[PDB]
Design an enzyme around this catalytic site. Structure first.
Site, PDB file in Angstrom:
ATOM      1  N   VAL A  16       0.111  -3.246   4.122  1.00 34.47           N
ATOM      2  CA  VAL A  16      -0.599  -1.988   3.958  1.00 34.47           C
ATOM      3  C   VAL A  16      -1.406  -1.683   5.223  1.00 34.47           C
ATOM      4  O   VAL A  16      -2.386  -2.373   5.554  1.00 34.47           O
ATOM      5  CB  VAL A  16      -1.417  -1.865   2.676  1.00 34.47           C
ATOM      6  CG1 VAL A  16      -2.073  -0.500   2.602  1.00 34.47           C
ATOM      7  CG2 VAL A  16      -0.540  -2.093   1.474  1.00 34.47           C
ATOM      8  N   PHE A  19      -3.324   4.091   7.258  1.00 35.39           N
ATOM      9  CA  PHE A  19      -3.154   5.223   6.366  1.00 35.39           C
ATOM     10  C   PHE A  19      -2.038   5.073   5.302  1.00 35.39           C
ATOM     11  O   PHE A  19      -2.045   5.866   4.350  1.00 35.39           O
ATOM     12  CB  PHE A  19      -3.001   6.540   7.140  1.00 35.39           C
ATOM     13  CG  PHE A  19      -4.131   6.896   8.092  1.00 35.39           C
ATOM     14  CD1 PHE A  19      -5.454   6.946   7.647  1.00 35.39           C
ATOM     15  CD2 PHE A  19      -3.865   7.239   9.421  1.00 35.39           C
ATOM     16  CE1 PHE A  19      -6.495   7.277   8.530  1.00 35.39           C
ATOM     17  CE2 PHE A  19      -4.901   7.618  10.290  1.00 35.39           C
ATOM     18  CZ  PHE A  19      -6.210   7.612   9.848  1.00 35.39           C
ATOM     19  N   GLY A  20      -1.151   4.070   5.400  1.00 34.22           N
ATOM     20  CA  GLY A  20      -0.111   3.930   4.375  1.00 34.22           C
ATOM     21  C   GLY A  20       0.462   2.562   4.057  1.00 34.22           C
ATOM     22  O   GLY A  20       0.073   1.566   4.664  1.00 34.22           O
ATOM     23  N   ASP A 131      -8.762  -0.971  17.588  1.00 34.18           N
ATOM     24  CA  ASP A 131      -8.266  -1.886  16.513  1.00 34.18           C
ATOM     25  C   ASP A 131      -6.986  -2.645  16.959  1.00 34.18           C
ATOM     26  O   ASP A 131      -5.953  -2.650  16.298  1.00 34.18           O
ATOM     27  CB  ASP A 131      -8.098  -1.136  15.153  1.00 34.18           C
ATOM     28  CG  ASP A 131      -7.546  -1.895  13.954  1.00 34.18           C
ATOM     29  OD1 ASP A 131      -8.215  -2.866  13.503  1.00 34.18           O
ATOM     30  OD2 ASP A 131      -6.500  -1.448  13.397  1.00 34.18           O
TER      31      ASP A 131
HETATM   32 CL   LIG Z   1      -1.759  -5.877   5.417  1.00 31.07          CL
END
Ligand SMILES: [Cl-]
Ligand SMILES: O=C(O[C@@H]1O[C@H](C(=O)O)[C@@H](O)[C@H](O)[C@H]1O)c1c[nH]c2cc(F)c(-c3ccc([C@@H]4CCCCO4)cc3)c(F)c12
Ligand SMILES: Nc1ncnc2c1ncn2[C@@H]1O[C@H](COP(=O)(O)OP(=O)(O)O)[C@@H](O)[C@H]1O
Ligand SMILES: Nc1ncnc2c1ncn2[C@@H]1O[C@H](COP(=O)(O)O)[C@@H](O)[C@H]1O
Ligand SMILES: Nc1ncnc2c1ncn2[C@@H]1O[C@H](COP(=O)(O)O)[C@@H](O)[C@H]1O
Ligand SMILES: [Cl-]
Ligand SMILES: [Cl-]
Lengths: 362, 159, 278
Positions: A16, A19-20, A131
Site C-alpha cells: 500500500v 495514495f493507493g 520520502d
Molecule cells: Cl506497504
C-alpha cells in the site's frame, strides 16, 4: 473468474503506497508482470490531491531512467485510475538489508551510484521525490535499484521554495523535521545519505525509540561511524549529512567524491535581498498594504505574510504581476521579499518594486 | 472498462445488470472487497447485487426506482471517464516563515569577463535584490531565465 | 561561411549566464559613464519610464562626444558632463537628426545580426525577446567573429579593409584633438605615429574610458602617449585565414596593415571581416 485491466490479470497486493493499493498484473497471453497502482477517484478527491496526481502522472509518463520504476500506462475508469508500471521481483531494498545484513563496500557503492543516478535524473527534471528510503528502493532479479513512490514528490519551480514536511522521521532532513522552507534537492541528498549509511552499516544513522532524542540527534547531525567504515565514505557521509543545507553535499560534490567515482559506470551520468525592517510583523504587513493601495495596485492576500499584487501599465496597457513575502531573519529583524510572476517585463518589475521601496523602512 | 466493487462481507456475491441481460456474474473477493472489471458501452446501465441470497443495491451508489417498485443501481459511463486528464479535470469540481539561506546566495558578489556570471539556483530567480541608495540613485537587480540561459539585469534608477 | 550564419540563431551565441546593465534616461550622465566602468561593461540599453520602452544605448562614443562637444579647458569643469541627464544630452546629441533603436530577436539568424550591424553602421546590437520585451544580451562583432572562427575547420588579393585616408595621430597629439578625430571621422581607433610615418602605438575608443575610470577627463590637453601610459601589426603578403586567426587569437578589434619598414598602409577591422563574409 479473473479480474483484468489492460490484458493483465490482477493478482496479489505488493503493498500500500502513498495514495493507493499496488497489485501484481500478469498478462493473459505473455505472462508479463506489471505493478498496478489503484487510485480511487473519490478518495484522491477527499484528500485534495487530484492536482498532485495530475502532475505526478504528467512527469512519470515522460521519465525514462534505468533506476526509476517505468510508468507504462494510465487506465482511467469511472470508479478509479489504474497506473500500470514496471514490476521488479526483488522487492524492497529494506528487506534485502534485513534478510542479509549490511552490503559490502563494493556492493554498497554500486547500489548507491544507481540510486543517486536516479535521484539526479529526477532533480534534472525539476522533480524532487521526497520520502526517499530503502522501503521505496526496489530491487530487480539482477540486483538493480529502482526508485518507486512518487506520491510525496513535488515540482521545483523557478524562484520558489517547498514547505511540506514529508518522509519517515529517520530519512527526513533536519529542515524538514524543523518544518523550515527548502529548495528540494538538498532534502533528497540527506535522505540518500541515510540510504548510504543503511547500505554500509545495515542500521540507521539517526534512530531512537525516544522521538525527542531522535529529532535532537538529527538536528545535531550526530551519527556513529563503526570502525569497519572506510574513512573516505565517512568523508562523503559527513558531507551529505550536513545539518546546514548551504554546507551540504550536492550531486556534483558527490559525483566528484573519490569514493563515489571508484568503478562508476558510464551509463549513469554589497547586494541586499528586498528590504529589512525591525518592526512587528503585523505593523509591517499593514504598512506594505497601505503602500500598495497608495500606488493604485490590485492585490490578493494569500497568507497573512504572502500578497499577490497586480499593476496596469499606464502606457502599453499591460498587466504586470509580483509577489511579496515577509521572512524572519534575526530574533529582532524581518525582511520583505519581492518576486516576479511570469505570464519590458523585467524593467517593469524593477519599477513596480522601486516605487514601494522609496515609501518604506530600510 | 468499468469497476464493480462490493464493500461488505459475504460468502458469495454476484452482479446482475442490463449489460449482461441480468445474468448472475460472480465477483472475486480479495478481502472485504468483491470486484469485477468489464467494459460497458458509453451510456446508461442498471445493475443489482446478489449478496448471499439477497438481492441488494449499493446504497452509496445512485439508484433508480421502477414504475413496478424495482430498486436498481444506475451507472452513467461517460466519455470523460475513459481519459485520465479529462477524468481528473472533471474531478476537481501564524508567524512569518524563516528566511531560506538560499536567498542570501547571490552571483554578483561571488583576468575574467565581468559580463559572465555563475549559474544560479532556480530558487533565487525572479527575486529582487538592491544596493544601498548612494547619491540618491537606486540600483535594482534580478536574474531571470530565458530558455536554457540566464540574465542578471541591473537597473540604475534615480529617486 | 555566409550560409553558416543564415542557419545559426542569435540565441546560440548568448552565454549560459550574463550581466546586463540598464540605465534610466533620467539618470545623471556622469553616473551613467562611471556605471559602465564599475560594472565592467562597454554599453548599456536606455529605458525611458515615460515612454515605457528601450529608446537607445549608452556607449563610449557618448563619452567621446560629451567630452569633445563640451571641453572648455583643464582649469574649467565640464558642467554639462557633471550635471546632465542621459535624456537632456540625447536631446542635444540628436536633434534635427533622429537615430531610432536597432535591435534583434534571439530567434533571428546570425546573418540577420551581421547585416543589422553594418546596415545601421554599429558595434553593439541588443538582443531583445519579443514576448518578454526584455533585453537579454548585447551582440558584438568580436563575439560573432569568435563564433565563426570556432567553426572554421592574401590581404592584397582580396582587398578588405580601409587603405585610403586613414585617420591617425602623432605621439604629442592632445586627447581633445584625438577626440575630435573620433567625432569627425567616426572610426574606432587612431594609430599613434612617430616623427616618421611609422606607428609606435594605437589610441582606441576604449582607451577613452580610462578617463572615466581614473577620473582624469578634466584634462584633455595631455598627449595621447601620456594618456596611454596606464597600460599589433599585419602585412599585405599574409593570408586572410591567418589574419582572421590573428584577430581572434589576440582578441583585438582591428589590425594595422603596415609595410616592411613598419609604416602604416591601411587598417582591417572586425567590421570589414564579418561584412566581406556576408
Ligand atoms: Cl506497504
Ligand atoms: O481497495 C480499494 O480501496 C481501498 O478500500 C479500503 C476499504 O474500503 O476497506 C480502504 O480502507 C482503502 O483506503 C482503499 O484504498 C479499491 C479502490 N478502487 C479499487 C479498484 C479495484 F479494482 C480494486 C481491486 C482490484 C483487484 C482485486 C483482485 C481481486 C481478487 C484478488 C486479487 O485482487 C481486488 C480489488 C480495489 F481494491 C480498489
Ligand atoms: N542599438 C542601437 N540603436 C541605435 N543607436 C545605437 C544603438 N547602439 C548604439 N547606438 C548609438 O550609436 C553611436 C555609436 O555607438 P557604437 O558604435 O556602438 O560604439 P562602440 O564602438 O563603443 O561600441 C552612439 O551615438 C550610440 O548612442
Ligand atoms: N584609423 C582609421 N582610419 C581610417 N579608417 C579606419 C580607421 N580605423 C578603422 N577604420 C575603418 O572604419 C570602418 C569601421 O570600423 P571600426 O569603427 O574600426 O570597427 C572600417 O571600414 C575600418 O577599416
Ligand atoms: N592593432 C592594435 N594593436 C595593438 N593593440 C591594439 C590594437 N587595436 C586595439 N588595441 C588595444 O586594445 C585596447 C582597446 O580595445 P578596442 O577599442 O576594443 O579594440 C587598447 O588597449 C588598445 O591599445
Ligand atoms: Cl506467478
Ligand atoms: Cl525482475
Amino acid at each position: 473468474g479473473r479480474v483484468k485491466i489492460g490484458h493483465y490479470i490482477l493478482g496479489d497486493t505488493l503493498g500500500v503506497g502513498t495514495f493507493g493499493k499496488v497489485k501484481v498484473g500478469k498478462h493473459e497471453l505473455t505472462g508479463h508482470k506489471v505493478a498496478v497502482k489503484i487510485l480511487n477517484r473519490q478518495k484522491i478527491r477527499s484528500l485534495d490531491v487530484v492536482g498532485k496526481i495530475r502532475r505526478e502522472i504528467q512527469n512519470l509518463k515522460l521519465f525514462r531512467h534505468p533506476h526509476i520504476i517505468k510508468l507504462y500506462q494510465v487506465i482511467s475508469t469511472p470508479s478509479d485510475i489504474f497506473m500500470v508500471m514496471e514490476y521488479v521481483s526483488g522487492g524492497e531494498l529494506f528487506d534485502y538489508i534485513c534478510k542479509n545484513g549490511r552490503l559490502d563496500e563494493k556492493e554498497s557503492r554500486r547500489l548507491f551510484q544507481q540510486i543517486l543516478s536516479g535521484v539526479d535524473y529526477c532533480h534534472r527534471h525539476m522533480v524532487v521525490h521526497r520520502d526517499l528510503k530503502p522501503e521505496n528502493v526496489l530491487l530487480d532479479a539482477h540486483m538493480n535499484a529502482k526508485i518507486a513512490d512518487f506520491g510525496l514528490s513535488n515540482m521545483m519551480s523557478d524562484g520558489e521554495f517547498l514547505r511540506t514536511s514529508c518522509g519517515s522521521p529517520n530519512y527526513a532532513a533536519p529542515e524538514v523535521i524543523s518544518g523550515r522552507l527548502y529548495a528540494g534537492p538538498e532534502v533528497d541528498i540527506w535522505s540518500s545519505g541515510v540510504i548510504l549509511y543503511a547500505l554500509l552499516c545495515g542500521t540507521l544513522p539517526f534512530d531512537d525509540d525516544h522521538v525527542p532524542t531522535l529529532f535532537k540527534k538529527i538536528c545535531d547531525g550526530i551519527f556513529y561511524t563503526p570502525q569497519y567504515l572506510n574513512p573516505s565514505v565517512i568523508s562523503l557521509l559527513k558531507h551529505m549529512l550536513q545539518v546546514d543545507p548551504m554546507k551540504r553535499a550536492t550531486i556534483k560534490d558527490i559525483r566528484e567524491h573519490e569514493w563515489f567515482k571508484q568503478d562508476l559506470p558510464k551509463y549513469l551520468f554589497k547586494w541586499h535581498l528586498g528590504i529589512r525592517s525591525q518592526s512587528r510583523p503585523n505593523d509591517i504587513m499593514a504598512e506594505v498594504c497601505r503602500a500598495i493601495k497608495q500606488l493604485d495596485y490590485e492585490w490578493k492576500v494569500v497568507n497573512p505574510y504572502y500578497l499577490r499584487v497586480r499593476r496596469k501599465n499606464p502606457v502599453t496597457s499591460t498587466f504586470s504581476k509580483m509577489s511579496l513575502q515577509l521572512y524572519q531573519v534575526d530574533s529582532r529583524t524581518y525582511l520583505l521579499d519581492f518576486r516576479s510572476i511570469d505570464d519590458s517585463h523585467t524593467i517593469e518589475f524593477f519599477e513596480m518594486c522601486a516605487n514601494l521601496i522609496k515609501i518604506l523602512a530600510q | 472498462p468499468t469497476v464493480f466493487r462490493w464493500t461488505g462481507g459475504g460468502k458469495e456475491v454476484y452482479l446482475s445488470g442490463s449489460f449482461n441481460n441480468w445474468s448472475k456474474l460472480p465477483l472475486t473477493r480479495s478481502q472485504n472487497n468483491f470486484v469485477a472489471i468489464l467494459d460497458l458501452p458509453e451510456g446508461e446501465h442498471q445493475y443489482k447485487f446478489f449478496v448471499d441470497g439477497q438481492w441488494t443495491h449499493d446504497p452509496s451508489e445512485p439508484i433508480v426506482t421502477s414504475q413496478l417498485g424495482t430498486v436498481n443501481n444506475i451507472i452513467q459511463v461517460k466519455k470523460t471517464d475513459f481519459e485520465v486528464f479529462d477524468a481528473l479535470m472533471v474531478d476537481s469540481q501564524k508567524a512569518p516563515p524563516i528566511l531560506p539561506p538560499h536567498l542570501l546566495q547571490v552571483i554578483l558578489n561571488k583576468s575574467c569577463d565581468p559580463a559572465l556570471l555563475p549559474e544560479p539556483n532556480h530558487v533565487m530567480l525572479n527575486h529582487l535584490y538592491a544596493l544601498s541608495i548612494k547619491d540618491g540613485v537606486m540600483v535594482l537587480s534580478a536574474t531571470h531565465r530565458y530558455k536554457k540561459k540566464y540574465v542578471t539585469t541591473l537597473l540604475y534608477k534615480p529617486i | 561561411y555566409t550560409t553558416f550564419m543564415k542557419s545559426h540563431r542569435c540565441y546560440d551565441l548568448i552565454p549560459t549566464s550574463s550581466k546586463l546593465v540598464v540605465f534610466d534616461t533620467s539618470l545623471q550622465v556622469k553616473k551613467a559613464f562611471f556605471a559602465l566602468v564599475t560594472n565592467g561593461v562597454r554599453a548599456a540599453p536606455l529605458w525611458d519610464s515615460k515612454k515605457q520602452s528601450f529608446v537607445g544605448m549608452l556607449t563610449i562614443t557618448d563619452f567621446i562626444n560629451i567630452l569633445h562637444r563640451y571641453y572648455k579647458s583643464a582649469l574649467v569643469q565640464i558642467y554639462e558632463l557633471e550635471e546632465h541627464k542621459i535624456e537632456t544630452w540625447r536631446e542635444v546629441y540628436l536633434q534635427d537628426s533622429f537615430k531610432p533603436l536597432v535591435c534583434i530577436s534571439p530567434n533571428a539568424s546570425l546573418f540577420d545580426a551581421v547585416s543589422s550591424l553594418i546596415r545601421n553602421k554599429i558595434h553593439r546590437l541588443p538582443v531583445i525577446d519579443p514576448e518578454s520585451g526584455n533585453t537579454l544580451y548585447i551582440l558584438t562583432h568580436k563575439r560573432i567573429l569568435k563564433f565563426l572562427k570556432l567553426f572554421i575547420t592574401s590581404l592584397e588579393e582580396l582587398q578588405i579593409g580601409t587603405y585610403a585616408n586613414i585617420a591617425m595621430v602623432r605621439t604629442t597629439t592632445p586627447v581633445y584633438v584625438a577626440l575630435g578625430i573620433f567625432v569627425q571621422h567616426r572610426v574606432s581607433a587612431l594609430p599613434v605615429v612617430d616623427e616618421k610615418g611609422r606607428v609606435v602605438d594605437i589610441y582606441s575608443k576604449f582607451d577613452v574610458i580610462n578617463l572615466a575610470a581614473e577620473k582624469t577627463y578634466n584634462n584633455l590637453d595631455v598627449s595621447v602617449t601620456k594618456a596611454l601610459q596606464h597600460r599589433l601589426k599585419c602585412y599585405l603578403h599574409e593570408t586572410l585565414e591567418a589574419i582572421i586567426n590573428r584577430l581572434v587569437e589576440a582578441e583585438v578589434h582591428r589590425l594595422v596593415v603596415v609595410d616592411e619598414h613598419d609604416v602604416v598602409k591601411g587598417i582591417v577591422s572586425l567590421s570589414d571581416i564579418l561584412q566581406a563574409l556576408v
